[PDB]
Amino acid sequence: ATLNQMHRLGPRKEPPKRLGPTEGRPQLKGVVLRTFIRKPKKPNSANRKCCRVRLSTGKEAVCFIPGEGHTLQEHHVVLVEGGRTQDLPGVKLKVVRGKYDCGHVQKK
Amino acid sequence: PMKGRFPIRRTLQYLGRGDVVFKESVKIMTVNYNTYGELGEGARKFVFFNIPQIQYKNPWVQIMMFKNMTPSPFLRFYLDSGEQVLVDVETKSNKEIMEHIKKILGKKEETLREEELEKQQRFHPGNFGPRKYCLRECMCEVEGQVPCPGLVPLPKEMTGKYKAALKAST
Amino acid sequence: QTNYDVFEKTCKELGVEYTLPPLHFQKVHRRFLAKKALCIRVYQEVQKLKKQKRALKAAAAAAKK
Amino acid sequence: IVRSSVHAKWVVGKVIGTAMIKTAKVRATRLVLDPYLLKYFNKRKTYFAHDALQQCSVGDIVLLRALPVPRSKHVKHELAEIIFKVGRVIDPVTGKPCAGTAYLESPLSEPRE
Amino acid sequence: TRFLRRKVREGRLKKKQIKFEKDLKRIWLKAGLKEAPENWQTPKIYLKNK
RNA sequence: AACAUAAUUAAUUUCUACGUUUAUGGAGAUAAAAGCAUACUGAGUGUGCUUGGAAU
RNA sequence: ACUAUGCUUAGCCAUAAACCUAAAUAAUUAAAUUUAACAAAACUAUUUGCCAGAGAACUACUAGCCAUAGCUUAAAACUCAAAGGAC
RNA sequence: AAAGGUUUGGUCCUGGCCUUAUAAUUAAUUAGAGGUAAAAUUACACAUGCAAACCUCCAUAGACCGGUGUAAAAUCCCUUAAACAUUUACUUAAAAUUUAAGGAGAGGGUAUCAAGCACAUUAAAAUAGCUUAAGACACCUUGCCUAGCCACACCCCCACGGGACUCAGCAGUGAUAAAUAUUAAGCAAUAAACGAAAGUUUGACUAAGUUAUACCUCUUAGGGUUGGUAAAUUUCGUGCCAGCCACCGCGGUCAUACGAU
Ligand code: FES
Ligand SMILES: [K+]
Ligand SMILES: [K+]
Ligand SMILES: [K+]
Ligand SMILES: [K+]
Ligand SMILES: [K+]
Ligand SMILES: [Mg+2]
Ligand SMILES: [Mg+2]
Ligand SMILES: [Mg+2]
Ligand SMILES: [Mg+2]
Ligand SMILES: [Mg+2]
Ligand SMILES: [Mg+2]
Ligand SMILES: [Mg+2]
Ligand SMILES: [Mg+2]
Ligand SMILES: [Mg+2]
Ligand SMILES: [Mg+2]
Ligand SMILES: [Mg+2]
Numbered sequence A: 001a002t003l004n005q006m007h008r009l010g011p012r013k014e015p016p017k018r019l020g021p022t023e024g025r026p027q028l029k030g031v032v033l034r035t036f037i038r039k040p041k042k043p044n045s046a047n048r049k050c051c052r053v054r055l056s057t058g059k060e061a062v063c064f065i066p067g068e069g070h071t072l073q074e075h076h077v078v079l080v081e082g083g084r085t086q087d088l089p090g091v092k093l094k095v096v097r098g099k100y101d102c103g104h105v106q107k108k
Numbered sequence B: 001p002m003k004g005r006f007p008i009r010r011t012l013q014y015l016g017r018g019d020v021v022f023k024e025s026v027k028i029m030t031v032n033y034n035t036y037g038e039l040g041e042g043a044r045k046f047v048f049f050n051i052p053q054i055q056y057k058n059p060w061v062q063i064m065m066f067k068n069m070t071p072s073p074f075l076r077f078y079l080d081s082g083e084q085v086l087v088d089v090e091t092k093s094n095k096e097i098m099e100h101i102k103k104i105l106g107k108k109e110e111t112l113r114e115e116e117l118e119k120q121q122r123f124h125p126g127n128f129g130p131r132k133y134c135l136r137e138c139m140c141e142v143e144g145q146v147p148c149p150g151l152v153p154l155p156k157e158m159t160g161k162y163k164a165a166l167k168a169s170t
Numbered sequence C: 001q002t003n004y005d006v007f008e009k010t011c012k013e014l015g016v017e018y019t020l021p022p023l024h025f026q027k028v029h030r031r032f033l034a035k036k037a038l039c040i041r042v043y044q045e046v047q048k049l050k051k052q053k054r055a056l057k058a059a060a061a062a063a064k065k
Numbered sequence D: 001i002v003r004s005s006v007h008a009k010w011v012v013g014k015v016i017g018t019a020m021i022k023t024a025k026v027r028a029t030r031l032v033l034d035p036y037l038l039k040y041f042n043k044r045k046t047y048f049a050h051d052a053l054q055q056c057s058v059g060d061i062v063l064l065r066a067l068p069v070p071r072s073k074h075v076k077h078e079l080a081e082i083i084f085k086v087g088r089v090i091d092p093v094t095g096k097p098c099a100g101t102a103y104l105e106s107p108l109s110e111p112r113e
Numbered sequence E: 001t002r003f004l005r006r007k008v009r010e011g012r013l014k015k016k017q018i019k020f021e022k023d024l025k026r027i028w029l030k031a032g033l034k035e036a037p038e039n040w041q042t043p044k045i046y047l048k049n050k
Numbered sequence F: 001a002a003c004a005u006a007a008u009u010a011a012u013u014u015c016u017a018c019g020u021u022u023a024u025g026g027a028g029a030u031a032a033a034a035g036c037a038u039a040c041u042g043a044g045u046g047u048g049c050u051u052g053g054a055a056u
Numbered sequence G: 001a002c003u004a005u006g007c008u009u010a011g012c013c014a015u016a017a018a019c020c021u022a023a024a025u026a027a028u029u030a031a032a033u034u035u036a037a038c039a040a041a042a043c044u045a046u047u048u049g050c051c052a053g054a055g056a057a058c059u060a061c062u063a064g065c066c067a068u069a070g071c072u073u074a075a076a077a078c079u080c081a082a083a084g085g086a087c
Numbered sequence H: 001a002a003a004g005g006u007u008u009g010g011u012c013c014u015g016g017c018c019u020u021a022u023a024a025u026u027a028a029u030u031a032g033a034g035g036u037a038a039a040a041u042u043a044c045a046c047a048u049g050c051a052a053a054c055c056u057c058c059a060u061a062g063a064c065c066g067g068u069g070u071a072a073a074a075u076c077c078c079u080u081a082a083a084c085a086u087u088u089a090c091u092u093a094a095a096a097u098u099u100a101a102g103g104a105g106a107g108g109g110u111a112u113c114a115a116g117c118a119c120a121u122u123a124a125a126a127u128a129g130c131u132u133a134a135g136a137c138a139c140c141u142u143g144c145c146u147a148g149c150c151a152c153a154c155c156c157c158c159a160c161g162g163g164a165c166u167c168a169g170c171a172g173u174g175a176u177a178a179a180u181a182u183u184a185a186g187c188a189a190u191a192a193a194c195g196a197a198a199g200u201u202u203g204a205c206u207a208a209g210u211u212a213u214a215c216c217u218c219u220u221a222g223g224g225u226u227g228g229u230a231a232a233u234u235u236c237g238u239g240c241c242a243g244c245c246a247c248c249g250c251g252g253u254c255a256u257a258c259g260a261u
């Protein structure tokens, strides 16, 4: 662009950073609604443990439960955090192990 | 590569090289110059090279430039009294034009130095306060004075916690 | 812009009317021409009412005097 | 005879309109430094000026004097001088009529008409 | 689904006319007139006039 | 709506009471010779145009 | 085999790979410059228009228009770590 | 940026995403004490206590300090004029502090907001003008100008009036939120108010209490990681399972990538 064109337009317009699953918040608290399995996109082949939760904001989201084995059930309380599950499409939330009803993986 | 011809003209160092600081009387400087010709070459260079420097040092002066309106290039200054100073810059180099206008309507070096000294009259080296305005925020920084308790713990006897305990004991 | 005296004779002799370029371009379409016509009409009516009120107000004052 | 408050005690501009009675619309331009580019561009302002004699024509350069008291909401200046008349310029250096970069009357001659 | 598109087009243009008419009523009412200017009838500009 | 009392130290009362916005078919996952524009039908063909096909 | 149509005279439609896929101008052929590669040797100055990862999308909505499946203007959610070009 | 990883059969170009640096908050695991700074989910609702007096009556003060970011593109800088609910002197001139009217210039977003609709001039009251792609008007969001300044003070933009009827003063409580300081001591210091004054008052403030949020001084050692980017895995179990990934990717029986060690 010419200097006259740069002057008339000024600095480049920067669209604001889009909010993610946590809505620009470190963590959210949600109530478990259902516990189900999600199938990772091929080439990945597994039965990943996830749960649907109603977050404090009022929306409903799917959250991956990390660790080998969880005791979560409906009506339980959990603290979810950010971080996408790469193989699971649409799963942008994860459960925090060791907070509220969710407990640390049981080393056996 | 910086765009345009002579991109050095768009640097703060170049703009600060201007030496023509007009007197407070000067209000407007109209520039009449011709884009084609041989006797108006110095005027064209003056608009190209010097007008940016003049405006930089004289932000409140209205510089308006007119092209191809008269047979010869000239400068006309309008003063606050109502006087009009016509200058003829035909067959004159851009450097000659700058020196001429400096002589007739430019502040002298002595006057400018006095204003610079006057501007800083209220800054005192001894004054304490924020870094933006003062050299030292607190007297703890000075050598020989009691240092800041955060950096160096104060003696127990100089602390309110200790003094209060003794008063209870008494 | 250069020789106004010659300009005046040329237009008069050649019979050419010169209109100056308008500072601002005006868009034209059915919605604009209809809204712009009403706005002019509304204004004129308001000013006509004001003139009538001024005449009546002055007439009453004159009678009192 | 106190002077105006407005900063623009003296402004030069071009008469861009003359359709108001005894008033001339004048466009002035100043140079403003672009902070990113460090280049000067033209910032133009419009000034209403009192033309007592209606002696102004579109396209002519004029000098305005700040009025001591604002005549109206927008009229805060008067016509001090017509620096250049549209098409009727008189060279300041020589004093002879000109039409562009040329002399309608040679400076060597002394018509005194 | 073109039939619906024509149906949507004819209903969209009708709302477009009402918005035009209402905007004209706002102007004269704000100016202080209690009736539209004499001999004025809002032109129907979105109907099949051509 | 807004007068008047007083006045041989000086004061008193009056100084009103319409419209406009938000909300409760389409496109995307886990896998359980050609082309462009356009018309018709169904990609087939028509008319013009391009070589990002080919031709000694 | 035959029709809309290609033709004419009056109105409308405003679309092409409407592309030489090259914006328009004034330069220079030296900067010891294939400054990717293929096209069409390279490069400089000036002015305007335009562009800012991909699909969603020559789409939705808005506005203009003798057009009414159209034309011009033109998003977001969404989803990904590619998409794309020359060899 | 001194860069790195990542499209392909391969090479080159283009182009995004990600990594490495720095910080704030919350969270998991972990931790001795001491000095310092800071303290912060919500303009949602609030039990209780306190936060403004002084003083020979009159007055003065409670218009400040303190708190919050409600509203508004709201502002900055500058000019002019006048004041003050003031001070100090003179019985009149220096200041501090404001107010009002303005403007050289600067000042967020959307142009699918493109026209606004009286927004102008003259001063016999006529003229038809004014702003606008050099961005008017409309709508949306936002405290900014940071020795500090602006705006607000339950709501009704205001507060005669009306009503959802008062902690956005300190400390506390409920609800809410990922978010968690004492219902504390003293007017000794400085500041403010009052008094002629000895003095009096102050949840300003001062000195403490609380908390790894930060730095300093010490002293215990814990947390994570170990395919590549990118410093560092030895034996076993599992076998596209269970799991792991910021990106590329790993696991279908010789796993440096998952789990234990
Ligand atoms: S900063 Fe000076 S005593 Fe702390
Ligand atoms: K790259
Ligand atoms: K923690
Ligand atoms: K308020
Ligand atoms: K005290
Ligand atoms: K360790
Ligand atoms: Mg062609
Ligand atoms: Mg036929
Ligand atoms: Mg739209
Ligand atoms: Mg914590
Ligand atoms: Mg305060
Ligand atoms: Mg706000
Ligand atoms: Mg409250
Ligand atoms: Mg209020
Ligand atoms: Mg409180
Ligand atoms: Mg209060
Ligand atoms: Mg905290």
Ligand SMILES: [Mg+2]
Pocket (backbone or CB within 6 Å): none
């Ligand atoms: Mg106390």
Ligand SMILES: [Mg+2]
Pocket (backbone or CB within 6 Å): none
């Ligand atoms: Mg005193």
Ligand SMILES: [Mg+2]
Pocket (backbone or CB within 6 Å): H255
């Ligand atoms: Mg093994």
Ligand SMILES: [Mg+2]
Pocket (backbone or CB within 6 Å): none
């Ligand atoms: Mg391992």
